[PDB]
Structures are given as C-alpha cells and as structure tokens.
Symmetry: C6
Subunit: 201 residues, 6 copies
C-alpha cells in the first residue's frame, strides 16, 4: 500500500495477505466479503489489488468473470481518456495500467503520489468491486420471493433470512406466516421494523 | 482511524477488523458487545464505522433496525443544523455526511482535523450505539421478573443471572429462595450486595 | 492509554482487549488475575479502565460489587477533596470524574498530562484493585484450616494447595500428615520452606 | 528485506518466515502459491530469497529443479554481462552474485541501494518465479482436455475446475454436458462467461 | 521495560505477559524455562519482574520458596550497602527497593536511567534466577545415578536422558548397556561425544 | 539483536523466541531447521544466540555435542588471535567472549558497533551452524545408497526422498525401478532433472 511516513510505499503485510485468503475460504462470495475486501485493501496499489485477487486459489469461474468486468471498465476508461514520451516525465495511464498489468510499481507510485494525484489504486478498486458485486449477485442462492416465514419460525429468524437475501440479491408482511401477518396487518401503516419485530415476538 | 504522528489517517487494521467480526459471531448482541464495539472503534472515521457494521454477515434484521435508528438521528441532526460552496473551503456536514454515506474519506478527515474539529466520527458512533442499545434490549431473552433463585441454586449464581438480565434489559430479596430470603430479611435495611452474598453463601 | 512519543493518548489495543476478556473467562477471580489486570492496564485512562471492566460479560454479581466499592472510594475522595469554572482552565476532578463516569477523555488526558500531573488513571486503578481483592477473597472456595495433607499426598502438592489457599484468602506442620509431621518436628525450629520440602520429599 | 526509514536493510520477520513455510505445506505448488511467494518476498534481498526457498523442508525434487533453472538464468546473465577491483569501489555482480551464493549481504545492500540501483533482489526473484512456474506446470494433475462437465454437475462447479486446470497448465462449450451444451449453443456467438453461467444455472 | 527511543519506560506487552504464563503452564520448572524467563524479562524493571512472577497461578510452594531466596539476597544487599533525604535528589536503594516492594516505578526508572546507572532491574533478576535455579534443582525428578541405558534403548535416547538429568541437577560409559559399553571401552581415552554416539549408533 | 534506529540493541522478541523453540519441537534436526535458525537469528548478539540454544528443552545429547564444536572453534580462534587493559578502552575478544560466556552484553554491543566493527555475533553464528550441520548429518536416518524407487512408487515421490536424503547427508537412474530406468537410459546423456521426471511421469 501507500501510506504516510510523506506518502510512501509499504509492503503488503502477511497479516493482510492471510486475512483476505481466509475470508474467501470461509465466506465465499457472501455479501459481507466486499466491505472486508475494501478495508483490507486500504491504500492499495494496483499491484496490491492484483496480489489479493491472485492469491485466491478457488472460485476460478468467479475470478475469470471478474477479469471480464475489469477489461470492460478498462476499455471504457480508454474510450474516455485516450493517451498520447517526454524524457523524465510522467506518462498518462491507460486502462491496463490502472489494472496493473502493463504498469510498473514505480509508475503506480508516481501516479498515486503526484500533485495532483492520479488515484489509480482507487480507480482500479472501484472496477474490482463492480465485478465482485456481480458475482455476489450471481451466487446468491435464493430469490426474495422464496423467503417466507415458517409455521413455527420465530419472526426474528425470518427477518434475518429476508434481509440477508435482499442484501445478496409490504413483501415482509405478505411473506410472514398467518399468525404474525394478522398481528402486523393490525399494526396499521407506517410501522418501523423494530415495531413489527416486537409485535410478532 | 485518525491518530497522532499531527493527527493523520491510518488504515483500519486486520486485527481490528477480525476482532469485531468475531465478537459478533461469538457474543451476538449480549450487552458487553457494546463496550467492545466502542473500544475497537477508537478514533474511527464514519467510513471505519460503516466498515465495521458492514463486515457483519449475520443478524441482518438487527442491522436493518440499526440503519433505521441511524436515519432517525441523521434527520434530527438536519433539523437542528441545516446546511447551505466557496472554492477550496470546508462545507458543513449533513446527517448522511456524518453517517458516511454521502461524504468522502477526505471530507471526513477534513472535518475531524479542522480547528475547531467537527468530530463526525464521534457523532456517528453515538448514533450507532443508540441503535445498538435498542437491539441489545430487544434481544434480551428474559424479564427481570422471571429471574428467581432456584431451590438449590447457589445465591451467587442467582445474583449473576439477575444482574446479567438487568444489564440486557428489594426485587433481589423478593426473588431469592425461602431459605436465603429469611436470612436476607433478618439482615435489616441498608445491606450491601457483598453483605447479602456473604450471608447466603 | 497514555504513553510517550511527549505523553500522548493511544487507543487501547485489540490485543489488550482480548487478553483481559480471556483471562477472566479462563481464570475467573483466582488471585493471579489481579496482577494481570494491573499489567494489562499499564498507562490506562479511567475510560480505558471502564472499557476493560465493561467488556466482561459474565460475573455480573462481582461487577456490581465492584461498582459498590468504587462508589465508596469516590465518596471518600469527595470528602477529602471538595471541588469548587475559569474560562480555558482545568477543573478539579471529583470522585465520579476519576471513575470516568462524569469526565471526558480530553479532561482525563488533561489531568494525566498536566504539570504537576493528576494521575486519575492510577487513582482509579487503586480503587478497582481494592474492589477486585474483595471479590477474590469472597470467591476463595476453601479455608486454610481445611487444607490438610492427604495420607499419600506428596508434600509438594499439599504445600501448593496451602499457599494457593492462603493467597486467595506452624499451621503448615500441624496440617501435614503424620509421617511428614514427624519428620518436620524433628527438623527443629527455624527451618526454611525449602528445607521442609526436601525433608518430606 | 530493504525498506525505507532512506532505504535500509530490515531482518526478515518470523511472521513472513512462517507464512511462506505454511503456504507450501498447505498448498504445495498450486498456482496461487506463486503470487503469495512474490508478495511475501516484497523488498527481499537475494539472501532473503534463499532463506525462503531453503526453509522449505519437503518437495526436494522441485527444489532441485528450481536450482537448475536458476543456474540456467545465471549463465545467461553471465553471457550478457561479463564482469571484469578498485579499492573501495562497487564490483559488478555475476549470476551467482545475483543468486546470492557468492555475494555477501553487504554487497547485495550496496547494489540494491546504489544510484543508479542494481535491483539484484528483483532480478533473482524473476528467475525464481520462472523456475516455480515450470514446477506448477509439472505438478498440474490434469489436462484441460479431461475436464468435462458431469451429468449432474452444476455448471459453476465445472467452470471452476476448467479454469483451475487452465491456470495450472469453445472448449468450454464442447466439454459441457448435453443439456447445458444445447442451451449454450442457442446463446449464439459472443456470449460472456457471466451469460453462459446464468444460462446453465 | 526500559528501552531506547533516550532510555524510556515501555509498558510490558500482552505478548510478553502471555508467553511467560504459558511457558510455566506448559514446562513447569524444567531447566529451559530459566533462559526463557531471562529473555522475556529483557530490560525489565523490578515492577515488571514482580508482574511476571505474580501472574503465575500455580506452583505456589515454589513461588513462596522464591520469595524466601529473594529476601535472603535483599538482606545481604542491605548488609553490604546500608542506606542513609535531600529535596529533589535520588535516594539510595535498599534490598526491598531492588525487589520492587518498597520502591515506586518512577524511582526504579530514576535508578535505571541515572548516570551512572544503578541497574536495579538486573540486580533483582539475578536474585530471581538464583531462586529459580534452586527450584529447578528441587523439582528434578531423577538422580544422574539412576539414568542407565536400557537393553534395547538407542544410545542417542539414553544420552538425551543423561544430559537432560545433568542439566536439571566416565559415568556415561559406566551407565551404558553391555553391548555399547564394550564398544565405548574399545574406543580408548579421549573420545568426543560425537565419536561415542557414532560408535554406538 | 542489533538493528538500526544508528545501530542499537533491541530485545529479542517473544515471537522470535517461540518460533525457534517450536521449529525444534516440530522438525528436530531436519536440514531445513538450519536456514530457519540463521534467519531467526538475524542481527543476533552472542547473548541472543545462547538464548536461542538454551531455550531448547529436548535433544540434550545434540546440545552437548554443539557445545563441544563451539569450544573447538573458540580454541582455534584463540590460537589465531591471542589477546593481551587501558582505562576506558575496548579489549580484544577471546573465543569464550565470542561465544558469549565470558563477555557482557555491553561488551558485545561495543564490539558489534565499533568502527571498524568486530562482528562477534556473526562469528559465533558461523561456529554454531558448523556444529548444527554435524548434528543434522548425524541424525540423518538413511543412506543415499538405500534410497531406491519402489515397484509402484511414483518417480516424483522417489526423487523427493532421494534429494531429501542427499540434503541431510547416475545414482538417481541406477536406483530407479526397472520400468523408469529403461525410459531414463533411453533419454541419453545430459538430461536435466525436469526431463527425467517428465519422462517417468
């Protein structure tokens, strides 16, 4: 990553490397892996971002899809920012430079610490999360339409499933079981979630 | 977080990230999770606070309720502090800025390190703990009225349950078993907890 | 805590937070938990001390007793140091300020780093350990009078139990078994512990 | 490694040492071990690189092959950069110097921190990864030609295997099972991977 | 401990605290615990040394014996260095000051960082190791006279036991079994251990 | 160890201490323990080196042999560098000084940071590794002559054993099984290891 000492490059830590690999092993593409990815990649160069992605051993279908999305964003970057070098001067980054496949670490450091800064690490991270979100959506196992409260399922457990599904991807009341539904309907309009859960507790 | 070097931004640590996720996995919304949250979020920006909340994978009912409380505090903030920008100057934060959904990290850093400082991290944390407390209360499994000493339950174990329940949510003596109750009644008024526990030991 | 960089505030560490919670989970109120508490709270502000106590999830009877002792010391502090503020100036701390319930972190930092320093962290820690010691004493399971060497119990194991009990709360010889007692009596006056243990080895 | 303080030598960490040894124990020569190796060897001197390789206890066939590749690159280096010393002056590195077998740490530090820098750590790392890639290829257990979707194998699981094999080492559709193949064929030309996987989901 | 920044006090680490407690739990008073103690107490003040000893929960017989030895060394210190204070000046340390029971941390820091330094941490550590060595000796389970090679015991295993016993507390050959003894006797005078072990391998 | 801040002494870390003790517990004297020892002792003083050796609890036969080798190197040092002190001046180190048994830490620091430096830590480490190598050789369980490919043993597994044995201590082809041997013989002269392994794969 790049962090302050002056902004300077620091080696990615074994702790960071292991944390990412483990989250993926343990959580796959559950939605909460994305915020973890973003935090673990705080201050990351494109090189660092590639390191994190490349250290993943499984899920190679997903990792290929991600490359596809990345290449799509890089092409759109090239469409909006065509590049044209002068001895000793900073060149303009193209898509594959931001994605760290045709740029060196030193070039990335130069862009990231220039004045004004060209935040290639942040730009690349945005593309990666765009791709990751597609994957989270794809690997979501259930439709919100199929999340319905069971006959003796605690309302809390049902709401947990409902919003967990919504995150991966009136209905709450509709999909509630008969007993709870009657209670919720009587609540009247404008009830908060807290109120509904207390009601069916 | 923001910490001294001068106050500067530091990336949230893998240790901090894991600690929070693990406490929630292991303790759910037992009351002692709140002090842990506050300590783990020492010096946190709103971005950091969102990271911590968002990295939680389960309990999505609770996490939705929390969003509700947060939006309520943000609206009250907007009611008390309407915002009106000048080139190069600091804008005033609105509710959603303090909650980190419409403000950038750099803006948050600017507010937090301004003179005088606008402690958006501390303001947001207060809202979050307000919401968390509601959840702790909701998920409290038992009424203090239902905590009564068992026939052969050690007084100490009963007092543990009693104050554990009180924390999540004369009575102590009333709910004690007959044998202990007689002892405690004879103690007379003004007895400390230490005295009562020694008495029924 | 407060530590040198100049004395400055540092966030309490996840390592420190976990260590304390784990010692309590694993050792309860065995006497050796107190020295651990004191060391883990090296340089602690009152806020930090409250964090450590509050992160404990079990033993709520004990934690209530501790609050009682703390309030007693705070009242005695107020009796000896009545407080009377001038714009921009440091106010005098009352009991509840030292206990961190009515003082802010910044006020605590101000007191702790003033010249001369008002060591509110050290004063509060003394009160807490006073209360903790009462609890260790209360939860001590056995009287030293009931620690007697078994017929075929190794002398070393008996001495371990004896001094372990003494810590939680002539007698050594008296409570020794017949065979060892005869040996020890013949040792004559003034024998060290090392000498007694070698003798009955 | 060499890192900034000025560039200075830092001892390789126990964390780094253990991480590498463990990845090899746990993952052998699966392709994702290479990006991990490169990241764990961030800033490494040739001495550090040798340390990492030499701390591996198993896989001695592979480690011998790696030495072979290294010696081949060192010979080609010597062919392109013949060396010819002046009292107090920096000598030119030969192949075995870059590979750290005939150069001292101080010499390596001198080369790496000279102006202009002679990046012997980076040059050696390139040779090592060249050799490691050969090994990954050798230890790849299956031909991409033998990766075919099973009768009731989820398309996602099949694509995972396919790209995992491709990494170690039209075909995707050809090797898909009859049911999925029909769907994919109807998709028409130009379908992305995301589209194919959704189609056969 | 005291370490350089200038020599300054640093809080004892949770890592250090746990390491010591664990070694004692896992190894008791095996001889190798002493070098570990000395290393873990690198730079320790007397306060730190007391912390380490006091955090031990078991072995209270041993811990009492240690106090006895410590008091004996402190008395001999007082015999050789009688103490006689001037406003603002450093007082001379007595035995119990070096042992940290009647001296404050600030006094210990003052002594340890004075010019010339009065190394109270090192002096106390010497006393503690003197006491620990007595305990290692006491808890040594076997006499070197009872370490004899078994009929089919590998010579290496026998030598391991022999020198392990010697550490806790011609003979090597004498106690070897008949077959090995014959070989060793034929070796002639002056044979190294390596030679003997190779011979009976 | 000694490291830069200026070169200064740093306490050996609990992480380093534990890593070494664990490697020995887990790997005994397998050859890869030596590179680990050298890396973990980066920057070590003789005191540190003794700490590492002395913290080992088992293998006391080996540890005695090591002392023997160390004393032999120290005697040869004394033969080549006889020592002859001037008030305030640095004395010359003898063998036992380099081995840290008759020199203080401060003396070791003085030698190691003098200009020109007298690298007593590096000199001692060389002696220790000389002794360790003897032990690795001694504890090697099998002769390379007894490493022969089994009838249905994969060539790769056989080569692993062969070079693992060679490390602890034409033949490769000779010791290969009949089927593989025929293939290898037909390969002709000059075949690399990679080529042989591919051939018999």
């Amino acid at each position: 990553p790049i962090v302050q000492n002056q902004m300077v490059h620091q080696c990615i830590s074994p702790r960071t490397l292991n944390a990412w690999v483990k989250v993926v092993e343990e959580k796959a593409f559950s939605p909460e892996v994305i915020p973890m990815f973003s935090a673990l990649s705080c201050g990351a160069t494109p090189q660092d971002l590639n390191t994190m992605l490349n250290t993943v051993g499984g899920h190679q279908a997903a990792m290929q899809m991600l490359k596809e999305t990345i290449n799509e964003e890089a092409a759109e970057w090239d469409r909006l920012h065509p590049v044209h070098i002068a001895p000793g001067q900073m060149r303009e980054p193209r898509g594959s430079d931001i994605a760290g496949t045709t740029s060196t670490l030193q070039e990335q450091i130069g862009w990231m610490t220039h004045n004004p800064p060209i935040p290639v690490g942040e730009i690349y991270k945005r593309w990666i999360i765009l791709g990751l979100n597609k994957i989270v959506r794809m690997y979501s196992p259930t439709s919100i339409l199929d999340i319905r409260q069971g006959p003796k399922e605690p309302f809390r457990d049902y709401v947990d499933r409902f919003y967990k599904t919504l995150r991966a991807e009136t209905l709450l009341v509709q999909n509630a079981n008969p007993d709870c539904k009657t209670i919720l309907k009587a609540l009247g309009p404008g009830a908060t979630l807290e109120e509904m859960m207390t009601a069916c507790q």
